[PDB]
Amino acid sequence: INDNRYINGINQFYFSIAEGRNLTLGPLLNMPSFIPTATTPEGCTRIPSFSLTKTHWCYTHNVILNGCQDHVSSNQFVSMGIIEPTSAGFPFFRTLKTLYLSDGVNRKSCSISTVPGGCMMYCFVSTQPERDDYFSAAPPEQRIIIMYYNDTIVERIINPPGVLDVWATLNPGTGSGVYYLGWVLFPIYGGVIKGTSLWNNQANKYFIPQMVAALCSQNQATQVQNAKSSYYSSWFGNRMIQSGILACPLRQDLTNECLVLPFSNDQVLMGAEGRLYMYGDSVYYYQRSNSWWPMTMLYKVTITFTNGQPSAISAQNVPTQQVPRPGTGDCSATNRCPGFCLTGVYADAWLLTNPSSTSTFGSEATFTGSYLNTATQRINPTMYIANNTQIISSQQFGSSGQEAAYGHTTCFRDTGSVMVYCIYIIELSSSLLGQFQIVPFIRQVTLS
Amino acid sequence: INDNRYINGINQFYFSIAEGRNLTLGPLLNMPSFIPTATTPEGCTRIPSFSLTKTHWCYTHNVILNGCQDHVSSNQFVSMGIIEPTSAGFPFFRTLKTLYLSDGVNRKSCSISTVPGGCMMYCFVSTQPERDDYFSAAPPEQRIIIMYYNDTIVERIINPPGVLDVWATLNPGTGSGVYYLGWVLFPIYGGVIKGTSLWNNQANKYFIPQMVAALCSQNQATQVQNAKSSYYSSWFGNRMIQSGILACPLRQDLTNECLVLPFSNDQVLMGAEGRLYMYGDSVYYYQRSNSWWPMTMLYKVTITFTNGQPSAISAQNVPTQQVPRPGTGDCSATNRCPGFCLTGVYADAWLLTNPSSTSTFGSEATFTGSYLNTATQRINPTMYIANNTQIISSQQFGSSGQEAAYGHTTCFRDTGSVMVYCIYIIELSSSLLGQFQIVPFIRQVTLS
Amino acid sequence: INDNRYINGINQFYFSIAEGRNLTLGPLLNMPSFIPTATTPEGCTRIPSFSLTKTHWCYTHNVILNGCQDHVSSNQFVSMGIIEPTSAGFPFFRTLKTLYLSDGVNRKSCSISTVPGGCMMYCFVSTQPERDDYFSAAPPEQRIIIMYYNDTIVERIINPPGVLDVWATLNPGTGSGVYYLGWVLFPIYGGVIKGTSLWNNQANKYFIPQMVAALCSQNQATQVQNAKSSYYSSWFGNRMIQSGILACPLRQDLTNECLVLPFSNDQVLMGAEGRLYMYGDSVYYYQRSNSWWPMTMLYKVTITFTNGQPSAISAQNVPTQQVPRPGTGDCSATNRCPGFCLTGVYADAWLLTNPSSTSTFGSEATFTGSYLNTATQRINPTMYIANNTQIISSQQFGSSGQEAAYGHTTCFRDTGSVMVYCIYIIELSSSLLGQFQIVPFIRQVTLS
Amino acid sequence: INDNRYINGINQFYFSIAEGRNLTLGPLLNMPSFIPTATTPEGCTRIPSFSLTKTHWCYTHNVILNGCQDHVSSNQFVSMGIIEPTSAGFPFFRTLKTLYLSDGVNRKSCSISTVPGGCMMYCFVSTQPERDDYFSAAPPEQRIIIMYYNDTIVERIINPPGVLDVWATLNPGTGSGVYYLGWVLFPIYGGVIKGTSLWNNQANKYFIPQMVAALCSQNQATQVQNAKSSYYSSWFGNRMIQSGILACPLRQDLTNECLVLPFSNDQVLMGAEGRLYMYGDSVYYYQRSNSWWPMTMLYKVTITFTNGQPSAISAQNVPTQQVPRPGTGDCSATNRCPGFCLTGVYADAWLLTNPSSTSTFGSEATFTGSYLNTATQRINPTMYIANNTQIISSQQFGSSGQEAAYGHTTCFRDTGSVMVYCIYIIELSSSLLGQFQIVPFIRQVTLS
Numbered sequence A, B, C, D: 001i002n003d004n005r006y007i008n009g010i011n012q013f014y015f016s017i018a019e020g021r022n023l024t025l026g027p028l029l030n031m032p033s034f035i036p037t038a039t040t041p042e043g044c045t046r047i048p049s050f051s052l053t054k055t056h057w058c059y060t061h062n063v064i065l066n067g068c069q070d071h072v073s074s075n076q077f078v079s080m081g082i083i084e085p086t087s088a089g090f091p092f093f094r095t096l097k098t099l100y101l102s103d104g105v106n107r108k109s110c111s112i113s114t115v116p117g118g119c120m121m122y123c124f125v126s127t128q129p130e131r132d133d134y135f136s137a138a139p140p141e142q143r144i145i146i147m148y149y150n151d152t153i154v155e156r157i158i159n160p161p162g163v164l165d166v167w168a169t170l171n172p173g174t175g176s177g178v179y180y181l182g183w184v185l186f187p188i189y190g191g192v193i194k195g196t197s198l199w200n201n202q203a204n205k206y207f208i209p210q211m212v213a214a215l216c217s218q219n220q221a222t223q224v225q226n227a228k229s230s231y232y233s234s235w236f237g238n239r240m241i242q243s244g245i246l247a248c249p250l251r252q253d254l255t256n257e258c259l260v261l262p263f264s265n266d267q268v269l270m271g272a273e274g275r276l277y278m279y280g281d282s283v284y285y286y287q288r289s290n291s292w293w294p295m296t297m298l299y300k301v302t303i304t305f306t307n308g309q310p311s312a313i314s315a316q317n318v319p320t321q322q323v324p325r326p327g328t329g330d331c332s333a334t335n336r337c338p339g340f341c342l343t344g345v346y347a348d349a350w351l352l353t354n355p356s357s358t359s360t361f362g363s364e365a366t367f368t369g370s371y372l373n374t375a376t377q378r379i380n381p382t383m384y385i386a387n388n389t390q391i392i393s394s395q396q397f398g399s400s401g402q403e404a405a406y407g408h409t410t411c412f413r414d415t416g417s418v419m420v421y422c423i424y425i426i427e428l429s430s431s432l433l434g435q436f437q438i439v440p441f442i443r444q445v446t447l448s
């Protein structure tokens, strides 16, 4: 279990609105990395997922032997452990168990979540190029693996209702899932088939971030028209790209008890990878900006239960115009106008302040994470702290041109020294070993 | 415990003399590294020690937060686990437990060894520059830590007889120790004080490798005179630099039961870092070439017991002239003449063939490891397979100029597929994260 | 163990009813304080707990580094020792062991008690402002730590039955607990949820001190109506503020064996901090006056066992109208009428005479302690001796305006010189070091 | 025993000459004080002595019940314990045993020292005003008390040779003593009788600090004449005020084995209180400036042994002109000219840098401590860091006018976090409890 110094400083808003204005990032601290490196120049480690809870943490990433492209073979590394203080005062992520799922099943886009006594992981089995998954009417096989600290492993092929003949494809969002009220929730996304109930119920819906108007040169009517069209992709089998949540009851005999809960397209942008968080008793969702709006998207999720089962989800966006991501064409970090786009990168963000603490939800929110500071290239990894309109502290890593990809950020507090630490898990392009080196950068978020 | 595919292919001579002539190295294989990386540009991870036995493996290395020099602070990372096959057929070193000794005690030059149920580690506590340790008449504090898989940890400050007022300094050789007949043996080295019994008993002794004569231009009398002087260092407090073995009975209340057994200087070169091996029932020793002879030094060690206690050790060298190491001045990879030298690098070697299988011990021996291919710079890390006079297979890693340091090699066989794998743990200079990145390169040693 | 001069003069009624009329306080005596001081101007030491028994004494207090407000970080100082005579004849509290619980767990409102061979401490873990604890339906984590004189420490998270979904919050009373018939008893208080069995069973109950009638201007019916309403707080989550006792069997593997025993609201006032005492074989309880009645509240507690387990408690009040405490608004030291109040200070009192020695329980009781002599400000610390209606001896400490807070009083007798000493542990506001300086004032209670 | 974080960071020069130039004092840190407070307004706690060694620390101070003057009654508080880290990272001095010597023997001017397994304390028995001790030809009784952690206590009246009929008085210097090569050394001072061998051998000797010339307006001949006269006091029985060292072999049956070793008056100023230190293997001495030169006096002491017994001591002064002390009349902090003076205060200093590391001994020395910043009044306690000519970092405590007295400073390093902490034990005048409050201020000495 996690050390007493951390058991009470996890999954919370660590600072007050007033303190948020005076936060800065400290120097990077050196700790033994708990994320394994490749041992060949062409080895590829990508798509990490990290879940940290009161008792322990779970980590996982995908491994491909040659280069970063396969739809046949790949292995998935899973790791779990606890956090303990070092003599220097900062955290050490102690690995207590390691697993390497290597058996021929091509598990991809996996999201992992902490559960009492272990980790629950949700993956889908890839057997063809991503684009092909959208054209085929049949969805990929879905699997959830539960790995207990006692070394028992139970994997199940799941068939949640409302998937077959509704979703041409379904993928976990790769971002962490969360254990909530006896259920494990995972972010999901995919393509919905035209003519289905889901499609019809989503027809004509769209979402436009609160701060777009002042930055977009198009008129309201034009924005609305383009926003509505941004949820349909002709390149991806003419499917409605949808975001959502997969809720699974914690059982070892899962078959069709998990529930697919899609977000209303009136509250969320075009479906994309994502991540779920827990701040106290509130659930939050991070949605990758793979569409027209290039800024960080965070939402407070309200979950409704009907007869002990999740029946509906509602999302309220934290309005910002900060931390853009690199994109292609007319959808780069500089874009501000609605339209159809299918480009971007995963870059979640951690809320250091409570958006509900202001009279108007999210009027003054502070968050931290990493982002690729460029308009169209996945380059210049940069850790930062920002509010709705400005970056108030940042430090680029490496020299300009340094390639990087996804970035998963997680913060917790040492209730002993009373300082907040954040771990920025960044996929860095390496020139020595492997295509990428996923690094768990760690540093303090100083108040002052 | 290790998978059935490996429990019977550990610590043995894998090939016959005839097969040794036809061995070549396979491509590097990609597996998740079990050796942690630094998370800051200046973080320093160095001095690894690796022990692999029938049941499991133990690994450890030193961590310094800023740069690679301290005599005050440092932490020691320890890891342990097993080996299991991946779907591709090659090994995966599964970490089952991790430990980070961070408490203010500056444990250095640690050697680790596998013991039933865990790992036994031997370190010394550094409190001043190495050179100062040789001038001070008092030796550094010595410690042996036993870490059980059940998470019990027992550290003891040891005071073996014949150390105080005999050895100005004492250091573990960093190379792995071995569990032999109920005793844990570790390689050691240090400086002996003038006038002590050990000094007197070693007076006038010297060792000259069998293949030096044909390569040295000096006459026999001159060689002998210089060889005798090579065991005394004026730069290191005028001490006799000695090599040896520390034998500790496996107990949890060690105080003064460990025994310091020095090698006769008539059979070994000037003391240096080292490593102990187990090939069947025979013990072997690797001695770093920190003296005049720049070639790989391996010896078959014969241990004598008197009343259930190790009482004396004898070393028989495997005569070779292959695999030189980079050195300074007149002691570079090109030197062949006796004289006093204090330069070199750690680069052990694994015997793929039995030296005792030939009518004349070691007449035709084959070994594998890594070495820095240059005369004086720690550059061009290169994995190889060689016999007494030639390198018969090699592959440099990275481009020329690539900095590197120590190299620990270990081989084992998959009794299922019937192939031998070797792990080459090499300290590589990195430009991204940390000063060094210790990498567990792994590849097959193919017969053909 | 305590000196022979004190082993037989602890936890008893030291004077007869007749002698009580002639008691006066002696001069303060100077002894080395056994309560540690802060070393910074802003350091805060507060909430002491002191337990003294035949064999030894236990002491503890909370430490906050900056100012006196945190719900995150804080440490708890624990101390234990014995009493021995000085050459001047008076006591010296000799500390034989010290402990500083500093590990990130925010242990608050701790009560300590002497147990055979050590101390047992009961705390709750604070993670949010006190008021928030009453609104949240879930109670704070509860912990009991046993610290043996042999340095063994065992802390357990306890989950006594009837707490979850019954008590929105639960706190130790900070006053000392007592070891009674193999069980350790601690005073407790908190807020009970509406609709629970406890709530229903307490419905319509109330308590009005015997001497209120003659001092209150309201009629009987009005008093009863207001008294009933004084047990419910809208400011504190609309909970029923309850007082009680937590009984724990002396074990090192406590989980859910401790029992929560609430006082009948027909015999006790609104729940508040408190303390338990032992006078011979009788248990007594001190209840802080945080409600409408501002006078010292002491009760003789009758404990019922059913199958070797405490099953019910009954309280009989010692009727007095002496020693008021400062309060806010219409609940100052001058108030005498029932109504809802939530203000006051901790100020226990020691009974120098047996209340059961008079034909009518407590008709003539004498007690000693300290109190803040003012109507609404925590000012003018004053040690005193008083009976049911008047203060018969007192001496203010420092000049008027001197700030102070809690006061814990304990008396014992030197069976050698035959004199009674009382220790008045008072939280004094300091201007030099720290916010407060907890001082163990000691003086004699002279008969004459 | 002390925590692993400190066992290797005690009694050493922590910084290099270069780092000394960039040292500054950090904020005062709050830890539970291990020095007991008085419990009455007139209680007096004074004359502390603190010894810290690899294994543990020893502390002691004198207690007088009414005011700060007695030559009859007084008690001596002794305390011992270890150092351990708090969750905030800084030290906590954990008291593991307390003792209160209260028995009628008026032990004064006590110096304490750490010894294997306990503390050794040296006091003298006062029975009359100090001045009277110098006029009486007989010296006060001398005592050394050894207090073992196992609670065994052995006190012995000692009669070292060369004291009777040589020293009219003899006093421990109150500053800590040190355990060196099996002997416990304590600083001493007193008055020597005219006509004795010691007197004759000291005749015409004198010492003038290296930096006086440039600051004194008198010529060399005049300075020499006045310096010679500064070692004789007509006010104190016309005795030669002498400084020295008392060496006692660690035994439990001491009688006359302790040796009185006086300093040559050619190397030291007029005798005064003092303290001994250990920096590595070198012994250092601090001499209170109770004479004409008002600056901090530190000397490297060279001890000579003859037949296993200390036979002579030599002192080499670290030349400075920094950190003056308040004095009376023509001997205030502003004085620079030789002459007879008998005024000053105890204010030792800790050397953060090695004086022997410069080609010329002490050419660039850095030290830290506290001092009363005023010319003649014991006022304005101020902690500082200084070099030979300037104060490079300082922070006054409290407001101007704040009375204070002695100051004992001690520094050690956390080899885990790699930071140096210093404890400044200062006698502060208090207005609440007691005449003085001896406070163990603690803060870090930051490099930068």
Ligand SMILES: *[C@@H]1O[C@H](CO)[C@@H](O[C@@H]2O[C@H](CO)[C@@H](O)[C@H](O)[C@H]2NC(C)=O)[C@H](O)[C@H]1NC(C)=O
Residues within 6 Å of the ligand: A117, A148, A150, A152
């Ligand atoms: C490891 O822990 C899990 C979690 O409790 C154990 O799972 C139980 O498995 C049995 C059947 O094998 C179920 O009937 C129980 O309901 C499971 N427990 C629950 C409710 O989670 C698992 O058995 C443990 N591993 C072992 C066998 O020691």
Ligand SMILES: *[C@@H]1O[C@H](CO)[C@@H](O[C@@H]2O[C@H](CO)[C@@H](O)[C@H](O)[C@H]2NC(C)=O)[C@H](O)[C@H]1NC(C)=O
Residues within 6 Å of the ligand: A363, A364, A365, A387, A388, A389, A390, A392
């Ligand atoms: C985000 O942070 C920025 C920078 O701190 C805020 O901008 C400052 O706003 C204040 C007004 O209160 C001005 O006085 C400063 O001059 C602004 N900084 C500058 C020069 O850019 C910004 O207001 C914050 N956004 C919010 C309100 O969330």
Ligand SMILES: *[C@@H]1O[C@H](CO)[C@@H](O[C@@H]2O[C@H](CO)[C@@H](O)[C@H](O)[C@H]2NC(C)=O)[C@H](O)[C@H]1NC(C)=O
Residues within 6 Å of the ligand: B363, B364, B365, B387, B388, B389, B390, B392
């Ligand atoms: C080490 O390996 C080398 C290379 O295989 C051996 O050298 C060969 O020796 C044979 C004689 O049996 C010659 O026919 C080859 O021409 C040699 N190779 C060349 C051209 O270098 C060498 O003999 C081996 N060393 C030993 C005997 O251990």
Ligand SMILES: *[C@@H]1O[C@H](CO)[C@@H](O[C@@H]2O[C@H](CO)[C@@H](O)[C@H](O)[C@H]2NC(C)=O)[C@H](O)[C@H]1NC(C)=O
Residues within 6 Å of the ligand: C117, C148, C150, C152
């Ligand atoms: C310190 O004293 C306690 C009190 O006796 C010892 O506690 C015992 O612990 C064992 C298990 O560790 C229990 O089975 C016993 O029942 C305990 N004794 C009881 C009944 O109180 C403790 O072990 C002592 N410390 C040590 C280990 O010396």
Ligand SMILES: *[C@@H]1O[C@H](CO)[C@@H](O[C@@H]2O[C@H](CO)[C@@H](O)[C@H](O)[C@H]2NC(C)=O)[C@H](O)[C@H]1NC(C)=O
Residues within 6 Å of the ligand: C363, C364, C365, C387, C388, C389, C390, C392
């Ligand atoms: C509490 O103490 C007071 C003071 O000693 C008692 O008051 C005295 O009562 C007697 C009657 O026996 C009168 O003669 C005195 O004149 C009273 N003192 C004064 C002038 O106030 C009081 O009776 C005691 N309370 C009880 C009975 O417990």
Ligand SMILES: *[C@@H]1O[C@H](CO)[C@@H](O[C@@H]2O[C@H](CO)[C@@H](O)[C@H](O)[C@H]2NC(C)=O)[C@H](O)[C@H]1NC(C)=O
Residues within 6 Å of the ligand: D117, D148, D150, D152
């Ligand atoms: C506490 O420790 C001391 C230190 O060892 C013990 O002292 C020994 O006392 C005996 C006589 O009582 C001497 O003969 C030994 O030489 C002492 N030891 C030495 C050399 O220091 C002391 O006895 C211990 N307390 C007890 C009695 O347990």
Ligand SMILES: *[C@@H]1O[C@H](CO)[C@@H](O[C@@H]2O[C@H](CO)[C@@H](O)[C@H](O)[C@H]2NC(C)=O)[C@H](O)[C@H]1NC(C)=O
Residues within 6 Å of the ligand: D363, D364, D365, D387, D388, D389, D390, D392
């Ligand atoms: C003691 O410290 C002072 C302050 O750092 C030193 O004075 C400085 O000396 C340098 C010369 O190297 C000048 O450049 C600075 O201007 C001086 N500071 C000032 C303005 O006072 C002083 O030299 C140190 N004393 C020594 C040499 O030990």
Ligand SMILES: *[C@H]1O[C@H](CO)[C@@H](O)[C@H](O)[C@H]1NC(C)=O
Residues within 6 Å of the ligand: A018, A019, A021, A022, A448
């Ligand atoms: C943060 O820093 C500003 C600028 O010094 C200060 O005024 C403010 O009080 C700080 N914020 C808080 C309340 O911590």
Ligand SMILES: *[C@H]1O[C@H](CO)[C@@H](O)[C@H](O)[C@H]1NC(C)=O
Residues within 6 Å of the ligand: B018, B019, B021, B022, B448
């Ligand atoms: C190795 O290869 C050589 C060359 O083809 C072959 O002649 C020899 O038999 C092989 N060695 C053995 C016996 O495996």
Ligand SMILES: *[C@H]1O[C@H](CO)[C@@H](O)[C@H](O)[C@H]1NC(C)=O
Residues within 6 Å of the ligand: C018, C019, C021, C022, C448
């Ligand atoms: C206390 O003092 C009163 C007044 O002098 C005296 O009459 C009485 O006997 C004393 N009480 C007792 C019995 O100790």
Ligand SMILES: *[C@H]1O[C@H](CO)[C@@H](O)[C@H](O)[C@H]1NC(C)=O
Residues within 6 Å of the ligand: D018, D019, D021, D022, D448
């Ligand atoms: C201390 O600070 C000075 C000024 O920035 C810097 O130049 C110097 O290198 C530092 N001293 C050292 C060597 O630590």
Ligand SMILES: [Ca+2]
Residues within 6 Å of the ligand: A132, A133, A134, A135, A136, A137, A138, A139, A140, A167, A168, A169
């Ligand atoms: Ca499909």
Ligand SMILES: [Ca+2]
Residues within 6 Å of the ligand: B132, B133, B134, B135, B136, B137, B138, B139, B140, B167, B168, B169
């Ligand atoms: Ca040495």
Ligand SMILES: [Ca+2]
Residues within 6 Å of the ligand: C132, C133, C134, C135, C136, C137, C138, C139, C140, C167, C168, C169
């Ligand atoms: Ca609650």
Ligand SMILES: [Ca+2]
Residues within 6 Å of the ligand: D132, D133, D134, D135, D136, D137, D138, D139, D140, D167, D168, D169
């Ligand atoms: Ca005298």
